[PDB]
């Protein structure tokens, strides 16, 4: 379901296509199911913990099927462009407060309105703790934008391959949780490529849309660079090129059809929201529940905020909406200091500390195959 078009708008650009709802990860899935079934997860995790850098040889002692899978998965696509990648990274850094806010509060809360992500995350067993699991898209979205992401001394190739490996492992594990099977609707196997592309629109497409709507200065070169970083990242995550949009016009159209209609409240999503709100409110950021609620509602809009169960705070939301664009125009250098209500500056400081504490200098545990 979800997806109804051909891939002529895609990175691969071809006329034909298989429905991404019924494609998973043909190279990773059986390699990980074997690694899990031979009881090699503890050992593979101790070995992979040593592999932290894009240019590093794989550690010896890996099982042969896994080594082969990994040396192939760490390859950059031939269409990756170094100059665009460096530019997309610079852009992400220069707009760091906006992109960090939008990933951590916008995309991270929107995830709790995406039923399959919420159920998979909620029921997933043996992986990261709940505290880390809930942050996982935002912190990966964040690290995607790093200056070094795809350079030899960076780590995003590492992060993407291990992430791809984790998704493969979950395809073999989640179906054995009766709780996930019973609530899955008709889906036999979790995390379709279609599902991955839903999350992608909740990240890349959403963030670009909101930055342009708020008046962040996004010239055409930067916008395409940011897209490219995201296209290379979808590929490195294991999304086939036939599903990755080629241009912003394609990404925007695909998001209206693939993301918008699947947003929905679930009990599992409700539970995830409370965890995320509690962790964010517990950071030493000054980001209280009222401020998170109002800003997340302004960002996501009222229909998504209602599904999520963020309560409408009409005064605070109106103050934000009337004045946040002035603050943005001021930080972008376009207007003199604006007379805005003082609480906007409070909000802005709370957001900056949030990016700092939750993402920038945040917790980065090693990405482990689940048990
Ligand atoms: C561009 C899309 C996505 C990104 C960037 C992403 C990122 C990540 C990362 C970084 C992890 C590792 C955290 C960890 O387990 O240590 C992970 C694990 C996982 N992801 Fe995703 N993911 C995406 C899509 C999906 C989708 C669509 C689903 C489900 C429908 C999903 C479900 C999970 C699950 C269940 C785990 C294991 C959670 C655990 O640790 O217990 N992800 N993801």
Author numbering: 32 to 402
The authors write:
The second type of rubber oxygenase has been named latex clearing protein (Lcp). Controversial reports were published on the cofactor of Lcp from Streptomyces sp. K30 (LcpK30) and G. polyisoprenivorans VH2 (LcpVH2)23, 24 but recently iron was detected in an almost 1:1 stoichiometry in pure preparations of LcpK30 and of LcpRr, and both Lcps were identified as b-type cytochromes. The typical, α-helical tertiary structure identifies LcpK30 as a member of the globin family. However, LcpK30 contains additional subdomains at the N- and C-termini beyond the globin core that form two caps located on opposite sides of the protein.
Here we report the three-dimensional structure of LcpK30 in a closed and in an open confirmation. His198 (F13) acts as the proximal axial ligand in LcpK30 and corresponds to His (F8) of GCSGsu according to the haemoglobin nomenclature. Interestingly, distal haem ligation in LcpK30 is not provided by a histidine as in most other globins and many cytochromes, but by a lysine residue (Lys167, E7) that corresponds to (His) E11 in GCSGsu and (His) E7 in haemoglobin. The presence of two axial ligands (His198, Lys167) to the haem iron in LcpK30 prevents the direct binding of dioxygen that is required for the dioxygenase activity of the enzyme and identifies this structure as a closed and inactive form. As a consequence, a conformational change in the vicinity of the haem group is required to allow for access and binding of O2 and of the polyisoprene chain to the haem site. The transition to the closed state only bars one entrance to this tunnel, but concomitantly blocks access to the haem iron by reinstating Lys167 as a direct ligand to the metal, thus efficiently preventing the reaction of the enzyme with dioxygen. Although LcpK30 is an extracellular enzyme, this conformational switch may well represent a protective mechanism to avoid the generation of reactive oxygen species from the reduced haem cofactor in the absence of substrate molecules. In summary, the findings for LcpK30 muteins with single amino acid exchanges of residues in the active site region were in agreement with the 5-fold-coordinated (open) state of the Lys167Ala mutein and with the 6-fold coordinated (closed) state in the wild type and in the Lys167His mutein with His167 as a second axial haem ligand. These data confirm that the unusual Lys167 haem ligand stabilises the protein in the absence of substrate in the closed state. z = 3.06 is typical for a low spin haem (Fe3+, S = 1/2), presumably from the closed state of the enzyme with Lys167 completing the octahedral coordination of the metal ion.
